[PDB]
Amino acid sequence: WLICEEPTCRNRTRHLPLQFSRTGPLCPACMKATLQPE
Prior knowledge:
Blueprint: H1 2-13, H2 31-35
């Protein structure tokens, strides 16, 4: 899941310019962990 938060979940912030995959059924609450680094 560390590979999820930093590289792939930062690319889910590239979904945030669109914001329909805000909910996103892939990983349990893993975009806020990317902000523990950002």
